[PDB]
Design a protein around this ligand. Structure first.
Ligand code: A1AMT
Length: 167
């Protein structure tokens, strides 16, 4: 859990302008969070980048999890292997508001982080899931009580997040 160059926002939330894949390789955290969908199909975005970095091992394991257990619910999670990126991957499903899913489930999604002492995570429901990223950071700060290191791979969004939080 050798995190470097993060800005501490609150006693338990830290943020960095960085690609979560590059962070996982440098840090080898105990837990990396994937911004998953309910069938664990890692077709693009953050999930696609994490799966590519495992040379598709994450997708094969995920398909075998879904066959045996069925899909996740929106707001839910499962713990699978971290492969070469971490000890464990916490696959968390935030709501996709661009597909009509309820934004209130973002609180449920961040509540899954509280079962793990330290996590490397992306900003849930941001990007093409359509949530307002400043709202997602506020939900994270108000909900997560364990130690979370957010990697946001966009300097423009990183700067807007830090400015809106420190105002
Ligand atoms: C908002 C961007 C900058 C961020 N991308 C990334 N953030 C951190 N490490 C990365 N590596 C490659 N991409 C990123 C991000 C945050 C959450 C989500 C998405 C994208 S999405 O569009 O894949 C849909 C799932 C939710």
């Amino acid at each position: 859990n050798s995190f470097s160059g993060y800005l501490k926002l609150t006693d338990n939330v830290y943020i960095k302008n960085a690609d979560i894949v590059e962070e996982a390789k440098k840090v080898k955290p105990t837990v990396v969070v994937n911004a998953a969908n309910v069938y664990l199909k890692h077709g693009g975005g953050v999930a696609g980048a994490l799966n590519k970095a495992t040379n598709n091992a994450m997708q094969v394991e995920s398909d075998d999890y879904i066959a045996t257990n069925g899909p996740l619910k929106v707001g839910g999670s499962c713990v699978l292997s971290g492969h070469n990126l971490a000890k464990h991957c916490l696959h968390v499903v935030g709501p996709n508001v661009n597909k009509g899913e309820d934004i209130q489930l973002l609180k449920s999604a961040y509540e899954n982080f509280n079962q793990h002492e330290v996590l490397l995570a992306p900003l849930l429901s941001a990007g093409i899931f359509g949530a307002d990223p400043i709202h997602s950071l506020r939900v994270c700060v108000d909900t997560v009580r364990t130690n979370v290191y957010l990697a946001v791979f966009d300097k423009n969004l990183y700067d807007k997040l830090v400015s809106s939080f420190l105002e």
